[PDB]
Amino acid sequence: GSHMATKARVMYDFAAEPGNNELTVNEGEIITITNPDVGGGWLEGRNIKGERGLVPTDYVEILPSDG
Amino acid sequence: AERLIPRRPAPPVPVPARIPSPR
């Protein structure tokens, strides 16, 4: 929102599946959110390196605006 | 879609919660 992407922090470590197009992440890591609602308990995001993928939204927390 | 979609429901999570939050 407001000329900037949405962001999230990781709450627990995760590892992607190759046939599911998920994104591997570590606890406390910050990622940009690309899609906060995809169905099935997930969200779309990208890490610092520039990889994208699906992540379980119960493993992460959406960060505040105007920060 | 013309965007990324989950092939399965989300896995279970190791949240510390004997009982879930009221909020």
From Swiss-Prot, chain A:
Modifications after synthesis and translation: Ubiquitinated by ITCH. Phosphorylated on tyrosine residues by TNK2. Phosphorylation promotes its activity in the degradation of EGFR.
Coiled-coil features, chain-numbered ranges: none
Tissue expression from the record: Widely expressed, with highest levels in heart and placenta, and lowest levels in thymus and peripheral blood leukocytes.
Compartments, as annotated in UniProt: Cytoplasmic vesicle membrane; Cell membrane; Cytoplasmic vesicle, Clathrin-coated vesicle; Golgi apparatus, trans-Golgi network
Domain SH3: 4-65
Subunit structure: Homodimer, and homooligomer. Heterodimer with SNX18. Interacts with ITCH. Interacts (via SH3 domain) with TNK2, WASL and ACTR3. Identified in a complex with TNK2 and clathrin heavy chains. Identified in a complex with the AP-2 complex, clathrin and DNM2. Interacts (via SH3 domain) with DNM1 and DNM2. Identified in an oligomeric complex containing DNM1 and SNX9. Interacts with FCHSD1. Interacts with ADAM9 and ADAM15 cytoplasmic tails.
Described function: Involved in endocytosis and intracellular vesicle trafficking, both during interphase and at the end of mitosis. Required for efficient progress through mitosis and cytokinesis. Required for normal formation of the cleavage furrow at the end of mitosis. Plays a role in endocytosis via clathrin-coated pits, but also clathrin-independent, actin-dependent fluid-phase endocytosis. Plays a role in macropinocytosis. Promotes internalization of TNFR. Promotes degradation of EGFR after EGF signaling. Stimulates the GTPase activity of DNM1. Promotes DNM1 oligomerization.
Domain notes: The PX domain mediates interaction with membranes enriched in phosphatidylinositol phosphate. Has high affinity for phosphatidylinositol 4,5-bisphosphate, but can also bind to membranes enriched in other phosphatidylinositol phosphates.
Family: Belongs to the sorting nexin family.
Name this polypeptide is given: Sorting nexin-9
Organism expressing this protein natively: Homo sapiens (Human)
